[PDB]
Write a sequence for this structure.
């Protein structure tokens, strides 16, 4: 899930 | 008259943004003095597996960094891990470094986001830390390192560097000590955010602002004690009320005590959506008492 | 992901704000080159009856001006009227003057407000010109002369200088030519803003942003043609849709066509039914297609 | 109303 931006 | 979510002017922070590249990762850094702070995942070499950042730092070569302020390139002297950040020592002092401090923000507090891409500011907007330690922002890929700040008597208080997006419009950063807000991990692995609740003390500020601006249709004539309301709030997506003393100025200007506003909140939570307040959703929680006082009176 | 009303960075405008005082009046001016623009009512000696501004300017006492940038005081060389503005020649060039243009904005267009007090920027926020040529701002008494601006390619396009408040949260300015938006007068005499209509093409941009952000509970399976919509709009406080092909890139990236959103607008006009779209409980027209594109794709 | 600000 987490998108490192 | 009027109430708008504002940012504080961004000029003093704009001159501190740099572009930080390593490999085919590019994000933003915050250049203060002779150091550049940036999220450590700029040195990660994967986008799906659990990252060993300590390994990634050990295979680091300083010459693969490219850090630039506009078209001016900074030479990298050293790198240290700082929680979820890298502290990159550079060979040049930022002559535009403002007076600054670091501060970790708490749920309910407002600050400003300077959204940056390619080491240049693109947009500025005010935000509010939520109970789940997320912010309702607007960030796309490239935005990590975007800083959050407040300005207090000429000193810039840095409170946020952007790190990741957990879900649509739910954004997570670290403070400048490198502690991730909410304890979320700067990993690509599965994690969901804690439950989002409306920050009630901010709704009370907003409702007092509404009263001051001539909005009264929603005002209950009922009344409920802070104790009892808190029982109800934790079952109805709202935080508990702990400070009230901050509202005595408003209660005195309006004649309306906190207990009537809590009754109103309960009733608005029923017919939720039936009518706007000052053009906003009736239970808006992004305005603090400080913001309201500044906008209504300049104090 | 996410959608927020945001402002472009203000640094380039902040160094152009000055304090302009005359008599008991104090507001803000815009210092570009060797000229300061400020609302002409800073030289008005009254607040209740119709002002003869030409008289006011005739008896003007040049040395009774105080114009300052921080603690740097500017000497006044001459003053001329420019519509609802005073164009004040001062004795110093602002060396931090950005590359700039002037442009009069049209209803539906977005711009940035740098809210100023005592000649110093205090806050920055995005606004959108309503059909009745007012903006939903946050200004109190010291705020006249606050500028509105856009930044395109390093050029600052100035479009607004704050003048007056018409109703609760209802604000009117002039462009930098001195032409008051909407034809309102900078006089302390009774004036009411005309009816406002939701700008439909902005409502469409908001709903496409909601689709891109995964919000789909409101999407109509049904459809309605622009014309059938345009007849319904003029009875329900919304503007008519003239052309749809600027939504082509939105239709192409969501797979949802305008005609389907027009039907959602109808059913959403007076009913979100207790649900929210991107935190909103009513339709909003403050986002333009251009703003949405930049926030969703850069 | 017109309040000159």
């Amino acid at each position: 899930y987490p998108q490192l931006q | 008259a009027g109430l708008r979510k504002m940012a504080q002017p961004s000029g003093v922070v704009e001159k501190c943004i740099v572009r930080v590249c390593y490999g085919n990762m590019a994000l933003n850094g915050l250049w203060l003095g002779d150091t550049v702070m940036c999220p450590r995942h700029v040195i990660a070499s994967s986008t799906t597996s659990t990252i060993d950042y300590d390994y990634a730092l050990s295979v680091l070569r300083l010459h693969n960094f490219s850090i630039s302020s506009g078209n001016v390139f900074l030479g990298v002297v050293g790198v240290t891990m700082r929680g979820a950040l890298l502290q990159i020592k550079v060979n040049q002092n930022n002559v535009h470094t403002p007076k600054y401090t670091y501060r970790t923000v708490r749920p309910g507090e407002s600050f400003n986001i300077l959204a940056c891409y390619d080491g240049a500011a693109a947009g500025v907007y005010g935000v509010n830390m939520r109970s789940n330690y997320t912010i309702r922002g607007s960030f796309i890929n490239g935005a990590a390192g975007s800083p959050g700040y407040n300005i207090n008597n000429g000193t810039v208080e840095f409170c946020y560097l952007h790190q990741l997006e957990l879900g649509s419009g739910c954004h997570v950063g670290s403070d400048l000590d490198g502690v991730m807000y909410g304890g979320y991990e700067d990993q690509p692995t599965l994690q969901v955010e804690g439950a989002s609740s409306l920050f009630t003390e901010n709704v009370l500020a907003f409702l007092y602002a509404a009263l001051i601006n001539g909005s009264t249709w929603w005002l209950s004539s009922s009344r409920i004690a802070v104790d009892r309301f808190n029982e109800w709030a934790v079952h109805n997506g709202m935080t508990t009320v702990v400070n009230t003393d901050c509202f005595s100025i408003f209660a005195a200007k309006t004649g309306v005590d906190v207990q009537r506003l809590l009754a109103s909140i309960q009733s608005l939570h029923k017919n939720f959506g039936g009518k706007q307040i000052l053009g906003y959703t009736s239970l808006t929680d992004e305005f603090t008492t400080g913001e309201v006082i500044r906008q209504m009176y300049g104090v």
